[PDB]
């Protein structure tokens, strides 16, 4: 609760370099901490999770056929 | 219709609670013990875990 | 006592067919181990696939299988009478009355019944209705008494014209066989004057097949054509192809399929050939084109080759079939069913095959009586007055058979939703003070005259109905014990 | 009557399975094959045909949709919904004491009124030139046939399939060919990698063209290996396909499309090789690509995809368009569906009920109410109130003479089907109504179901 509330208020002021430090349990700079990920890794997990999950979104009932 | 949307959405929730933390050193793990052959695997990623565990949930095929 | 236990198991046979009586009747669904869906009103196909327990159930099956020869239609209003005679006879069997008096008294009632049926049947001939009339106007509702209610108006202007080509004293049932064509409409079925069969196999030149022939000639050959060894096997098949061309046959029917060598030789010369010819289709050509079947090429001669007027390649239902027209001798007109539903094709298949039986018996003798179940009412009315003076106890015995015929109007009211008592009171005065011909009318939902209704039924159906129900009911009473080993 | 009451309730449960799949917007449901494989497709005819239930009443609807798949192939959900709607009204009229045939007689008479009313709404698209006519065929698949996602713009691989049947069919606007039009799939790449050529591409195993010949001299068929080459040198064929350049383990049926397009023949044995079987092929180059630049009716669309269901669902949508285009070319009667003709034909039957009165007034009302189930089902699938949707359609069709106003599933704005280019075959809606009522008459005749002993 408190850690996410401080992180949500940090980006609310226009600071995109903040983050969640699990070692010290506080808000720290991700660039100085050493946490960096590629943009292609971001687009791959976000776009695939939204499109692949559409199978169970539009299908509210599943019917299985008996073994032949 | 009531349990149709429930059992389908919880297919990844039941065995996926341990792999949610996979990113980061604090990630929880899962132990898969075979009934024979004296084999097993320990990993925090659900890739090998899902493929090596047969499930009757139709949503697991997706 | 042992017969009573056997009757109760046989009562449910016609009680499942209970609603099926009349043109408003229903159908029975049967699913076998092969998952073959069969929906039909005729009880012959029902009793054939019906699981039997006691041997008395097979008695009704043997009569139903023999019903096609005696009558062939109206099986719903016939077989049900065999169970009704034994239903009301239960109080008599419990008393000191022996089953022999029931069997002996039954023949005395049928002898009086058939005498009245022949009296009801009247043949005027003279200037009254003739061919193309009796088979149309009076046979409008007579051909199909159960199914094809909405499509009846279509077949009267079609199916009647097909059976008109059948002359009396011949009555060939081998050439009336139909085919199953998926897709299309019922009223759009084309009339076929010759042998037509399915290809059952696809060709690479299927689209390149010749469209039509001016003077085709059909030849039936059983020679199998299939390919130093290479030159020998290819030459022997080539020599057989040249000997066939010497006869000048534009159409060659082969029992076994042919390879590419026989196909390419016939395609360049524009010679038609068809493989996988069934043995039943060969006998159909012999009675139409008049050819012959040659096993080998030793005895083949030019005079064995028949001919027909013209050939045509018909494309229907996204598939092409062989069509013959203008055969030298054709006693009937081939009909091809259509529609997308397989059950509907099999539904009218049993109905059209039952309609030809009327044309068969009409050509021998032309007779019509009042239909709609009014035949048994006039017979039952006459048996009540005669049986009083006939051989003692036979009064109550015949009266039981007289009341057994009352099930027919009770069944017609069950489907139409009428009252069983109300129809008996109106017919009792209609068959006594109203003379005879007044029947029941389903359209106006009241009692009226079948003479002005135009609905008649052949009296020959009721004649064989009592004879078919004679040995059927007598066998139940003549068997007092049933033994099943293991 | 109690036996058929449970059959109608069981038939309504079957229609509720595909109820959400009705229309192009209709959502599918996950189907599990008995072998464990999952089947995900937006085609209503594919899921219903592969699904097998217990009661025989559901199996009777399978045979009804089986004929719809081989004829129409797209939109078979409305066949079961219309058939179930006639049975839903049977719980009332039959309970009132009226015989089913009396109700069935009103359906056949009302069907002729719907066909006659649907014929007046026919709009001929062949009256214009070939530029606007061929454009309507491509735009016909742009909206009505579009179902699955990513289909928003499908015209990349669709125009190849639309123009495929155009070059095969003659300009007299009457043709049918089911022999040479087939779909050939490939697992890999993307759906955008498809190509349109004249020929066939197989999975089994270049030369410059010549002057007189059409090039490559295609002929369909160590001492013995060189001896057969000398026979090829007599005809001069550059590329020769040897079944029994050379290929290994090729099928006979796969080579049929090559011999027909190139006017060649199958050579049973090397002794029968002749020059008369020499064909013409424009170019052959590598998986060899067979192309023909001459006039022929053989056209095969090579399709690629990352999964089997992606290629299978794409082909079934393009293969079913053959019957759609044929009804837009060979058949000059073209009508606008999607809530337009369904509501229009329902208003004509409703007026006939008050004219005849008697027992046919309630019988004709059941037929008009059955046709109103399609827009109410599409309203729930589109997120619109069924009562408010039909109240808007009927209000505009009575006040205005335009009969093309219909249900809008995807939010196209104006409900006019003429501006949205939503077309349905005229013979399609005719066969769906007749064959559905054809089965409903047999359902009402069911008394006792006989099943063989297990």
């Amino acid at each position: 609760s408190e850690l996410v509330s401080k992180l949500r208020s940090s980006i609310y002021n226009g600071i995109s370099t903040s983050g969640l430090d699990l070692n010290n349990g506080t808000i720290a700079d991700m660039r100085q901490l050493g946490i960096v990920e590629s943009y292609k890794l971001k687009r791959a997990v976000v776009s695939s999770a939204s499109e692949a999950a559409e199978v169970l979104l539009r299908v509210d009932n599943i019917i299985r056929a008996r073994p032949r | 219709a009531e349990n149709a949307r429930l059992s389908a959405f919880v297919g990844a929730i039941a065995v996926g609670d341990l792999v949610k933390s996979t990113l980061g050193p604090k990630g929880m793990d899962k132990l898969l013990q075979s009934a024979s052959s004296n084999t097993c695997m320990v990993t925090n990623d659900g890739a090998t875990i899902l493929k090596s565990i047969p499930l009757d949930n139709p949503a697991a095929k997706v | 006592g042992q017969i009573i236990s056997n009757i109760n198991a046989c009562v449910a046979v016609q009680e499942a067919l209970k609603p099926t009586l009349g043109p408003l009747g229903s159908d029975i669904l049967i699913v076998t181990s092969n998952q073959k869906t069969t929906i039909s009103n005729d009880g012959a196909t029902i009793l054939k696939l019906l699981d039997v327990v006691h041997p008395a159930a097979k008695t009704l099956v043997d009569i139903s299988r023999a019903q096609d020869a005696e009558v062939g239609d109206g099986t719903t209003s016939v077989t049900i009478l065999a169970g009704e005679l034994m239903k009301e006879a239960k109080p008599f069997l419990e008393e000191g009355i022996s089953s022999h008096l029931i069997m002996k008294g039954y023949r005395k009632a049928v002898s009086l019944a058939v005498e009245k049926i022949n009296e009801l049947a009247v043949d005027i001939t003279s200037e009254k209705s003739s061919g193309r009339e009796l088979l149309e106007r009076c046979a409008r509702t007579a051909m199909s008494s159960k199914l094809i209610h909405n499509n009846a108006d279509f077949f009267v202007k079609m199916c009647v014209d097909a059976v008109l080509s059948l002359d009396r004293n011949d009555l060939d049932d081998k050439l009336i066989g139909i085919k199953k064509i998926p897709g299309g409409a019922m009223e759009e079925s084309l009339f076929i004057n010759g042998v037509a069969f399915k290809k059952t196999f696809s060709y690479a030149g299927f689209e390149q097949q010749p469209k039509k022939f001016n003077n085709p000639k059909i030849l039936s050959l059983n020679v199998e054509l299939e390919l130093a060894i290479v030159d020998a096997e290819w030459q022997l098949i080539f020599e057989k192809l040249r000997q066939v061309e010497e006869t000048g046959a534009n159409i060659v029917l082969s029992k076994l399929p042919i390879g590419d060598l026989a196909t390419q030789f016939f395609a360049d010369r524009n010679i038609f050939c068809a493989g996988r010819v069934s043995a039943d289709d060969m006998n159909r050509v012999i009675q139409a084109v008049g050819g012959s079947i040659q096993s080998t090429t030793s005895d083949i001669k030019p005079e064995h080759l028949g001919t027909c007027a013209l050939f045509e390649e018909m494309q229907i239902g996204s598939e092409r079939y062989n069509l013959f027209q203008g055969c030298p001798q054709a006693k009937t007109c081939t009909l091809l069913l259509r529609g997308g539903a397989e059950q509907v094709i099999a539904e009218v298949e049993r109905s059209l095959h039952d309609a030809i039986m009327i044309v068969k018996r009409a050509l021998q003798n032309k007779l019509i009586v009042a239909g709609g179940g009014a035949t048994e009412m006039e017979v039952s009315k006459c048996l009540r007055d005669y049986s009083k003076t006939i051989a003692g106890k036979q009064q109550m015995i015949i009266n039981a058979f007289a009341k057994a015929l009352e099930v027919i109007p009770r069944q017609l009211c069950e489907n139409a939703g009428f009252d069983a008592i109300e129809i008996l009171n109106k017919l009792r005065l209609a068959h006594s003070k109203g003379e005879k011909w007044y029947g029941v009318v389903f359209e106006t939902e009241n009692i009226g005259d079948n003479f002005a209704k135009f609905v008649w039924e052949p009296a020959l159906v009721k004649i064989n109905a009592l004879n078919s129900a004679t040995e059927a009911t007598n066998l139940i009473l003549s068997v007092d014990e049933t033994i099943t080993n293991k | 009557l109690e036996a058929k009451k449970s059959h109608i309730l069981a038939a309504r449960s079957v229609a509720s399975i595909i109820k959400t799949s009705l229309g192009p917007r209709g959502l599918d449901k996950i189907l599990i094959s008995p072998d464990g494989e999952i089947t995900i497709t937006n085609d209503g005819a594919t899921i219903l045909s592969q699904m097998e239930l217990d009661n025989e009443i559901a199996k009777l609807l399978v045979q009804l949709s089986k004929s719809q798949d081989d004829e129409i192939g797209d939109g078979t959900t409305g066949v079961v919904v219309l058939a179930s709607a006639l049975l839903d009204q049977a719980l009332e009229l039959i309970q009132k004491g009226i015989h089913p045939i009396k109700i069935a007689n009103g359906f056949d008479e009302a069907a002729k009124l719907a066909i006659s009313k649907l014929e007046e709404t026919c709009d001929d698209i062949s009256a214009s030139n070939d530029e606007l006519f061929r454009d309507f065929l491509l735009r016909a698949a742009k909206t009505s046939l579009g179902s699955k996602i990513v289909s928003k713009d499908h015209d990349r691989f669709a125009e190849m399939a639309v123009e495929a049947v155009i070059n095969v069919m003659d300009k007299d606007r009457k043709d049918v060919d089911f022999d040479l039009i087939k779909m050939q799939g490939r697992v890999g790449g993307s759906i955008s990698d498809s190509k349109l050529i004249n020929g066939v591409i197989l999975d089994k195993d270049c030369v410059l063209p010549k002057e007189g010949s059409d090039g490559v001299k295609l002929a369909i068929l160590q001492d013995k290996f060189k001896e057969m080459i000398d026979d090829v040198k007599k005809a001069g064929a550059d590329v020769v396909i040897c079944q029994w350049p050379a290929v290994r383990w090729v099928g006979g049926q796969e080579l049929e499309h090559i011999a027909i397009s190139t006017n060649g023949r199958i050579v049973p044995r090397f002794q029968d090789l002749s020059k008369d079987k020499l064909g013409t092929c424009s170019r052959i180059y590598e998986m060899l690509i067979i192309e023909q630049s001459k006039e022929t009716k053989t056209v095969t669309c090579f399709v690629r995809g990352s999964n089997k269901m992606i290629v299978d669902e794409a082909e079934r949508a393009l293969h079913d368009s053959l019957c759609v285009v044929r009804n837009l070319v060979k058949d000059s009667r073209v009508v606008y569906g999607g809530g337009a003709a369904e509501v229009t034909m329902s208003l004509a039957v409703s007026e006939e009920a008050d004219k005849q009165r008697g027992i046919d007034q309630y019988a004709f009302r059941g037929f008009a109410q059955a046709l109103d189930t399609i827009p109410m089902t599409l309203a729930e699938n589109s997120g619109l109130d069924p009562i408010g949707t039909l109240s808007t359609l009927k209000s505009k069709q009575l006040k205005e003479k335009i009969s093309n106003i219909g249900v809008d599933c995807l939010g196209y704005g104006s409900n006019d089907m003429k501006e949205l280019f939503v077309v349905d075959p005229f013979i399609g809606k005719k066969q769906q109504i007749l064959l559905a009522t054809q089965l409903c008459r047999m359902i009402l005749k069911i008394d006792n179901v006989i099943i063989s002993g297990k």
Side-chain angles (χ1 to χ4, degrees):
Chain A
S1 178
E2 183 178 2
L3 295 176
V4 176
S5 296
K6 293 177 179 177
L7 178 61
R8 185 176 179 84
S9 296
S10 178
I11 61 172
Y12 176 78
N13 291 336
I15 295 170
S16 64
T17 59
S18 63
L20 177 63
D21 186 4
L22 296 175
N23 291 337
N24 291 336
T26 187
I27 303 301
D29 181 67
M30 295 296 102
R31 181 177 64 84
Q32 293 177 336
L33 179 63
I35 303 301
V36 175
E37 293 179 351
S38 63
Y39 176 78
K40 184 173 178 290
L41 177 63
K42 302 298 183 181
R43 182 177 64 84
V45 296
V46 174
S47 178
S48 296
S50 178
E51 294 177 351
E54 294 177 351
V55 176
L56 295 175
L57 294 174
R58 66 182 182 275
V59 175
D60 58 353
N61 290 283
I62 295 170
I63 295 170
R64 179 182 293 177
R66 295 183 181 276
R68 181 177 64 84
Chain B
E2 182 67 14
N3 290 336
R5 66 183 182 276
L6 295 175
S7 64
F9 295 163
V10 299
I13 295 171
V15 297
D17 290 344
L18 296 174
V19 299
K20 293 177 179 177
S21 295
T22 299
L23 296 175
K26 302 299 183 181
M28 293 178 181
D29 292 345
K30 184 180 173 63
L31 189 148
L32 276 66
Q33 186 174 355
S34 178
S36 63
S37 296
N38 290 336
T39 59
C40 56
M41 183 65 73
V42 175
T43 187
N44 61 345
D45 186 4
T48 301
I49 295 171
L50 177 63
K51 294 177 179 177
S52 63
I53 294 172
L55 295 175
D56 290 344
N57 189 340
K61 302 299 183 181
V62 177
Chain C
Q2 296 296 100
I3 297 170
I4 295 170
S5 296
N6 292 337
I7 294 171
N8 290 337
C10 295
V11 173
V13 176
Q14 69 282 0
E15 294 302 321
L17 296 175
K18 179 180 76 179
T20 61
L21 276 68
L24 296 175
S26 63
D27 290 344
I28 303 301
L29 177 62
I30 295 171
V31 176
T32 59
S33 63
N34 290 336
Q35 295 300 321
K36 182 178 179 180
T37 299
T38 299
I39 295 170
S40 178
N41 194 340
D42 186 5
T45 59
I46 295 170
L47 295 175
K48 183 178 179 180
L49 296 175
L50 177 63
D51 291 344
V52 296
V53 176
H54 190 277
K58 184 173 178 289
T59 299
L60 296 175
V61 176
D62 290 344
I63 302 301
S64 179
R65 293 182 182 175
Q67 186 66 260
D68 291 344
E70 296 301 321
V71 176
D73 60 10
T75 59
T76 59
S77 63
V78 175
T79 301
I80 187 169
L81 296 175
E84 183 67 14
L85 295 174
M86 297 297 103
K87 183 178 179 180
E88 295 301 321
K90 181 174 178 290
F92 295 160
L93 295 175
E94 294 177 351
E95 294 177 351
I97 302 301
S98 64
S99 63
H100 182 63
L101 296 175
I102 304 301
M103 294 183 286
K104 180 179 76 179
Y106 176 78
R107 295 183 181 276
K108 294 181 181 297
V110 175
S111 296
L112 296 175
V114 176
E115 183 178 2
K116 301 299 182 181
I117 294 171
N118 290 337
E119 183 178 2
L120 295 175
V122 176
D123 297 347
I124 302 300
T125 61
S126 178
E127 295 177 350
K128 290 180 179 178
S129 296
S130 178
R132 295 177 63 185
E133 295 301 321
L134 177 64
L135 276 66
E136 182 178 2
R137 184 182 296 275
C138 296
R140 185 177 180 85
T141 59
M143 291 177 70
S144 178
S145 64
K146 55 182 178 181
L147 296 174
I148 304 170
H149 182 62
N150 297 131
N151 291 336
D153 292 344
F154 296 159
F155 294 161
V156 174
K157 302 299 183 181
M158 292 177 70
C159 183
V160 176
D161 291 344
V163 297
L164 178 63
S165 63
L166 178 62
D167 290 344
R168 65 182 181 89
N169 291 336
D170 291 344
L171 299 176
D172 186 4
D173 290 344
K174 294 177 179 177
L175 296 175
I176 62 172
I178 59 99
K179 301 298 183 181
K180 184 185 292 179
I181 295 170
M186 296 301 294
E187 70 281 4
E188 294 178 351
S189 178
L190 296 175
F191 296 160
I192 305 302
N193 290 337
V195 177
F197 58 89
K198 295 176 179 178
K199 301 302 287 185
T200 63
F201 179 78
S202 178
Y203 295 138
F206 178 80
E207 70 281 4
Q208 295 300 321
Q209 295 299 321
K211 183 178 179 180
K212 62 182 178 181
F213 293 157
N214 290 336
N215 290 283
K217 294 176 179 177
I218 295 98
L219 177 62
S220 296
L221 296 175
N222 290 337
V223 176
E224 182 179 2
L225 297 175
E226 183 67 14
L227 296 175
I229 295 170
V230 176
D231 290 344
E233 294 178 351
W234 182 88
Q235 185 63 59
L236 296 175
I237 304 301
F238 177 80
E239 295 301 321
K240 294 177 179 177
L241 296 174
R242 181 177 64 84
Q243 294 177 336
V244 176
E245 184 67 14
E246 294 177 351
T247 59
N250 290 336
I251 295 171
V252 176
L253 296 176
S254 178
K255 183 178 179 180
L256 296 175
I258 60 172
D260 290 344
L261 177 62
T263 300
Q264 294 176 337
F265 178 80
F266 295 160
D268 291 344
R269 295 183 181 276
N270 290 283
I271 302 301
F272 177 80
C273 183
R276 294 182 182 175
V277 176
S278 63
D280 291 344
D281 291 344
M282 294 178 182
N283 291 336
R284 185 183 295 274
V285 176
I286 295 170
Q287 295 300 321
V289 176
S292 64
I293 295 170
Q294 295 300 321
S295 296
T296 59
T297 59
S298 178
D299 291 344
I300 184 169
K301 301 299 182 181
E303 71 278 5
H304 298 291
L305 176 61
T307 187
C308 56
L310 59 82
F311 177 80
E312 183 178 2
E313 185 178 3
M314 177 178 71
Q315 185 174 355
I316 184 169
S318 296
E319 185 177 2
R320 294 182 181 175
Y321 296 139
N322 291 337
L323 188 148
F324 295 160
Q325 186 174 355
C327 295
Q329 185 174 355
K331 301 299 183 181
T332 58
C333 183
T334 300
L335 296 175
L336 296 176
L337 295 175
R338 295 177 64 183
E342 183 178 2
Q343 295 300 320
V344 176
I345 295 170
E347 182 178 2
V348 297
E349 183 178 2
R350 297 287 294 173
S351 178
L352 294 175
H353 296 166
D354 291 344
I356 191 65
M357 294 300 295
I358 295 170
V359 177
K360 291 165 61 181
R361 62 180 64 88
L363 295 174
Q364 294 177 336
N365 290 283
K366 295 177 179 178
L367 58 83
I368 58 172
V369 296
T375 300
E376 295 84 357
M377 295 296 102
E378 183 67 15
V379 175
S380 178
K381 180 59 165 60
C382 296
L383 295 175
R384 294 183 181 276
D385 291 344
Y386 296 141
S387 64
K388 294 176 179 177
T389 59
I390 299 301
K393 294 176 178 177
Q394 295 301 322
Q395 184 175 355
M396 294 177 182
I397 295 170
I398 295 170
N399 289 336
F401 295 159
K403 294 177 179 177
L405 296 175
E406 294 178 350
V407 64
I408 303 301
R410 294 182 181 275
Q411 293 302 323
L412 297 175
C413 295
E414 183 67 14
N415 291 336
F418 296 159
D419 186 5
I421 296 171
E422 183 179 2
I423 186 169
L424 295 175
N425 290 283
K426 294 177 179 177
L427 293 175
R428 181 177 64 84
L429 296 175
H431 298 290
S432 178
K433 294 177 179 177
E435 294 178 351
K436 294 181 181 297
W437 291 95
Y438 294 144
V440 62
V441 176
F442 296 159
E443 183 178 2
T444 60
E445 295 177 351
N446 63 346
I447 302 301
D449 186 4
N450 290 337
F451 178 80
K453 181 59 166 60
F454 296 159
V455 174
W456 290 279
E457 294 177 351
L460 296 175
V461 176
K462 303 300 182 181
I463 294 171
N464 290 337
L466 296 175
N467 291 336
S468 63
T470 299
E471 296 301 321
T473 59
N474 290 337
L475 178 62
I476 296 170
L477 295 175
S478 64
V479 174
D480 58 353
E481 184 178 2
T482 299
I483 295 171
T484 299
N485 291 336
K486 294 181 181 297
Chain D
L1 296 175
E2 294 177 350
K4 291 189 295 184
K5 183 178 179 180
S6 63
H7 297 166
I8 294 171
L9 296 175
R12 184 176 178 84
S13 63
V14 176
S16 64
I17 296 170
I18 60 172
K19 183 178 179 180
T20 59
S21 64
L22 178 62
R25 182 176 180 170
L27 296 175
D28 59 9
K29 292 177 178 177
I30 294 171
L31 177 62
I32 303 301
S33 178
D35 290 344
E37 183 178 2
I38 184 169
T39 299
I40 295 170
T41 187
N42 290 283
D43 181 67
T46 300
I47 295 171
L48 178 62
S49 178
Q50 294 177 336
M51 183 177 284
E52 183 178 2
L53 275 67
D54 291 344
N55 190 340
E56 295 301 321
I57 303 301
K59 294 177 179 177
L60 295 175
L61 296 175
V62 176
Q63 294 178 336
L64 177 63
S65 63
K66 183 178 179 180
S67 63
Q68 294 299 321
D69 181 67
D70 291 344
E71 295 301 321
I72 305 301
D74 186 4
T76 60
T77 299
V79 177
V80 177
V81 175
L82 178 63
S84 64
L86 295 175
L87 296 175
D88 290 344
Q89 295 300 321
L91 295 175
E92 294 177 351
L93 297 175
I94 304 302
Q95 186 64 59
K96 294 177 179 177
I98 297 171
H99 189 277
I101 294 172
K102 294 177 179 177
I103 302 300
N105 290 337
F107 293 160
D108 290 344
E109 295 301 321
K112 294 177 179 177
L113 178 63
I115 295 170
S116 178
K117 180 62 174 172
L118 179 63
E119 183 178 2
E120 294 177 351
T121 59
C122 295
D123 186 4
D124 186 5
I125 61 172
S126 63
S128 64
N129 61 345
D130 290 344
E131 182 178 2
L132 296 175
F133 178 81
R134 295 176 63 185
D135 181 67
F136 295 160
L137 296 175
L138 177 62
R139 294 182 181 276
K142 183 180 172 63
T143 300
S144 296
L145 295 176
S147 178
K148 62 180 293 180
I149 61 172
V150 179
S151 64
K152 182 178 179 180
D153 186 4
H154 54 284
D155 291 344
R156 185 176 179 84
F157 59 90
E159 183 178 2
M160 296 177 182
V162 174
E163 296 302 321
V165 297
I166 295 170
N167 291 337
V168 175
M169 293 177 71
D170 290 344
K171 293 177 179 178
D172 291 344
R173 300 289 182 268
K174 183 178 179 180
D175 187 4
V176 58
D177 186 4
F178 58 90
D179 289 343
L180 297 175
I181 295 170
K182 292 177 179 178
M183 296 300 294
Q184 185 64 59
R186 179 65 180 87
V187 175
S190 63
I191 191 65
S192 63
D193 291 344
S194 64
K195 294 176 179 177
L196 177 62
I197 60 172
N198 291 337
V200 62
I201 295 171
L202 296 175
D203 59 353
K204 301 293 183 291
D205 291 344
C206 56
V207 63
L208 296 175
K210 298 293 180 64
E211 183 178 2
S213 64
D214 291 344
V216 179
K217 293 177 179 177
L218 178 62
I220 295 98
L221 188 147
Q222 295 300 321
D223 290 344
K224 183 178 179 180
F225 177 80
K226 294 177 179 177
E227 183 178 2
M228 294 183 286
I229 296 171
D230 291 344
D231 290 344
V232 175
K233 293 177 179 177
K234 294 177 179 177
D238 291 344
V239 175
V240 176
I241 295 170
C242 183
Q243 185 174 355
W244 291 94
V247 296
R248 300 289 182 268
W249 291 95
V250 295
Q253 294 178 336
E254 294 178 351
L255 296 175
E256 294 177 351
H257 300 290
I258 296 170
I260 294 170
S261 178
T262 60
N263 290 336
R265 293 182 182 175
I266 303 301
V267 177
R269 300 289 182 268
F270 59 89
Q271 186 64 59
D272 291 344
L273 177 63
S274 63
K275 184 179 179 180
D276 291 344
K277 294 177 179 177
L278 178 64
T280 59
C281 183
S282 296
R283 292 173 296 180
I284 293 171
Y285 62 91
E286 183 178 2
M287 177 178 71
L288 295 175
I289 294 171
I290 294 171
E291 295 177 351
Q292 185 174 355
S293 63
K294 301 299 182 181
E295 182 178 2
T296 187
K297 294 181 181 297
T298 300
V299 175
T300 300
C301 183
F302 178 79
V303 176
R304 296 176 64 185
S306 63
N307 290 283
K308 180 179 76 179
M309 295 301 295
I310 295 171
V311 176
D312 181 67
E313 184 178 2
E315 292 178 350
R316 294 183 181 276
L318 296 175
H319 182 62
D320 290 344
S321 64
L322 176 62
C323 296
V324 176
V325 175
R326 181 177 64 84
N327 290 336
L328 296 174
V329 176
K330 183 173 178 290
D331 186 4
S332 64
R333 294 182 182 175
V334 176
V335 297
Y336 297 141
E342 295 83 357
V343 177
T344 299
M345 294 183 286
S346 178
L347 296 175
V349 177
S350 296
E351 294 177 351
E352 183 67 14
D354 291 344
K355 294 176 179 177
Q356 295 300 321
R357 293 182 182 175
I359 61 172
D360 290 344
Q361 185 174 355
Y362 296 140
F364 295 159
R365 185 181 296 275
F367 178 80
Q369 185 64 59
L371 296 175
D372 290 344
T373 59
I374 295 170
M376 293 187 287
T377 300
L378 295 174
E380 294 178 351
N381 291 337
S382 63
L384 296 175
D385 181 66
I387 295 170
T389 299
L390 274 66
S391 64
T392 300
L393 297 175
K394 294 177 179 177
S395 296
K396 301 302 287 185
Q397 293 178 336
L398 294 175
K399 294 177 179 177
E400 294 178 351
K401 294 177 179 177
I402 295 170
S403 64
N404 291 336
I405 296 171
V407 177
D408 184 4
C409 296
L410 293 175
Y412 292 96
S414 178
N415 291 336
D416 186 4
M417 294 296 103
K418 183 180 172 63
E419 294 177 351
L420 297 175
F421 296 159
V422 176
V423 295
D424 288 343
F426 177 80
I427 187 169
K429 293 181 180 297
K430 183 178 179 180
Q431 294 178 336
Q432 293 177 336
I433 295 170
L434 295 175
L435 294 175
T437 301
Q438 184 64 59
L439 178 62
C440 294
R441 291 194 296 272
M442 293 183 286
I443 302 301
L444 296 175
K445 293 176 179 177
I446 295 171
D447 181 67
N448 290 283
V449 176
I450 294 171
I451 296 170
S452 178
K454 183 178 179 180

